[PDB]
Design an enzyme around this catalytic site. Structure first.
Site, short mmCIF file in Angstrom:
data_model
loop_
_atom_site.label_atom_id
_atom_site.label_comp_id
_atom_site.label_asym_id
_atom_site.label_seq_id
_atom_site.Cartn_x
_atom_site.Cartn_y
_atom_site.Cartn_z
N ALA A 23 4.74 -5.32 2.41
CA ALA A 23 3.64 -6.28 2.48
C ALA A 23 4.07 -7.76 2.35
CB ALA A 23 2.61 -5.93 1.42
N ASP A 137 -4.23 -2.95 -6.97
CA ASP A 137 -3.80 -2.29 -5.74
C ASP A 137 -2.88 -1.13 -6.00
OD1 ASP A 137 -3.95 -1.90 -2.99
OD2 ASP A 137 -2.43 -3.37 -2.54
#
Ligand SMILES: *CCC(=O)NCc1ccc2[nH]ncc2c1
Length: 341
Positions: A23, A137
Site C-alpha cells: 500500500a 485496518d
C-alpha cells in the site's frame, strides 16, 4: 535499482530481492551489513500528496513510540541528508517469512495455530488500545508471520487516537477499514473512532482462520452490510434502539426478517470455545462487543493468557490542516535520529 526504479538503501543494505508491492510502494529484502541479517525495506514516495504525507507521518510517529513483541518495529529509516534532496523515505523492519493473507491462500491452520495467532493479535492489540490508539485496518495482509509463527501487526498509516465522544455520524457516509473487515456500524452511524472497530476486524480474521475464506465477502461497499446481516440475522429491538439516526434505523427496519446462522453450522470442525469468542467479537452492537482484555481472558486462550506478560504502553497518545510542506518538514525531523549526521 530494482525492477526499473531506484531503490537506494546506501551501502549498509545490499543484495536486494523484490518481495512485492504494498500500500506504500515497493518492498524488498536486503542484507544488513551491520547486523548481519536480512531485513525488509519499504520505499515510500509521499511528498507530492498531503494525504500520503499524513499516513507516512502517522506510521513513523506511532511505530517509533511503540515497542512490543507483536508490533512490527522500525529498525532504521533512510533518507537524504537535507529536506531539499529528500524525495523518498525507506523504512527498514524485521524480515518476516510471510503474512496471514498469503498463508491463508494455501495453508490449513491447526486449532493450535489459530489459537496462538489469535492470542498474539489480541496481545498486540491490547498494547495499541492501551495507548488510546485504533489501528483501523486490521486484516490478514497486515499480520506478518515468521518461520516460527511469531506474529507482528503492521501498517499504522490509517491509525487514529480514539475519540468515542465524536464517533456518531449519518448513514452510508463512512469509509473506515478494508471492506471485508469493516464493522456494521461504519455503514450505519460510526466514524470508527472507538476501540470496538478493531475488535470486529479481529473477529473477521478469526472466522477467516477457521475456514480460509473471508466470512463477509462484500463485492462492493454497499454489499458489505448484506453479508453481515445474512449471518448475524436481524438486530434486536434493543440494538436498533441504539441507532438514533433515522435513515440508518429505518433502513434496518425496512429489511425482511433474517435468522441468525449458527456458528457451528458455518464452522462444523471449529473448537466450540473459539466459536464462543467469535460470537462475542462479531456482536452487532459495538457497546456489547467484547473488549481486548476480555478477549484475552476468554477460555479459548487459557493456555496463553498471562496479564503480567501482556504489556501496556507507558505513554498514551493534528495532521489534517497541515500543508504537505510542513508535513515533509515533520517527517524530516521525525527521521533525524537515524542519520549518521
Ligand atoms: C503491514 C503490511 C506491510 O507493510 N507489508 C510489507 C512488509 C513489511 C515488513 C516486512 N517484514 N518482512 C516482510 C515484510 C513485508
Amino acid at each position: 535499482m530494482v525492477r526499473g526504479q531506484v531503490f537506494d538503501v546506501g551501502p549498509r543494505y545490499t543484495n536486494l530481492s523484490y518481495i512485492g508491492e504494498g500500500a506504500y510502494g515497493m518492498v524488498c529484502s536486503a542484507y544488513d551489513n551491520v547486523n548481519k541479517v536480512r531485513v525488509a525495506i519499504k520505499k515510500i514516495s509521499p511528498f507530492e500528496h498531503q494525504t500520503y504525507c499524513q499516513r507516512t507521518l502517522r506510521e513513523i510517529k506511532i511505530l517509533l513510540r511503540f515497542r512490543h513483541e507483536n508490533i512490527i518495529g522500525i529498525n532504521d529509516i533512510i533518507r537524504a541528508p537535507t529536506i531539499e534532496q529528500m524525495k523518498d523515505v525507506y523504512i527498514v523492519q524485521d524480515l518476516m517469512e510471510t503474512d496471514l493473507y498469503k498463508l491463508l491462500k494455501t495453508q490449513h491452520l491447526s486449532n493450535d495455530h489459530i489459537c496462538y495467532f489469535l492470542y498474539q493479535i489480541l496481545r498486540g492489540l491490547k498494547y495499541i488500545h492501551s495507548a488510546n490508539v485504533l489501528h483501523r485496518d486490521l486484516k490478514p495482509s497486515n499480520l506478518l508471520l515468521n518461520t516460527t509463527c511469531d506474529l507482528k501487526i503492521c501498517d499504522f498509516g490509517l491509525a487514529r487516537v480514539a475519540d468515542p465522544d465524536h464517533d456518531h455520524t449519518g448513514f452510508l457516509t463512512e469509509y473506515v477499514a478494508t471492506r471485508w473487515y469493516r464493522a456494521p456500524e461504519i455503514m450505519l452511524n460510526s466514524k470508527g473512532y472507538t476501540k470496538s472497530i478493531d475488535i470486529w476486524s479481529v473477529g473477521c480474521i478469526l472466522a477467516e482462520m477457521l475456514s480460509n475464506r473471508p466470512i463477509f465477502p462484500g463485492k462492493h461497499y454497499l454489499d458489505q452490510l448484506n453479508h453481515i446481516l445474512g449471518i448475524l440475522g436481524s438486530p434486536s429491538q434493543e440494538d436498533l434502539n441504539c441507532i438514533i439516526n433515522l435513515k440508518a434505523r429505518n433502513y434496518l427496519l425496512s429489511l425482511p426478517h433474517k435468522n441468525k446462522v449458527p456458528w457451528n453450522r458455518l464452522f462444523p470442525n471449529a473448537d466450540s470455545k473459539a466459536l464462543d469468542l467469535l460470537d462475542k467479537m462479531l456482536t452487532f452492537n459495538p457497546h456489547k462487543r467484547i473488549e481486548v482484555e476480555q478477549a484475552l481472558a476468554h477460555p479459548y486462550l487459557e493456555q496463553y493468557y498471562d496479564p503480567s506478560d501482556e504489556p501496556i504502553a507507558e505513554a498514551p497518545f493534528e495532521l489534517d490542516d497541515l500543508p504537505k510542506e510542513k508535513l515533509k518538514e515533520l517527517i524530516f525531523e521525525e527521521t533525524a535520529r537515524f542519520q549518521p549526521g
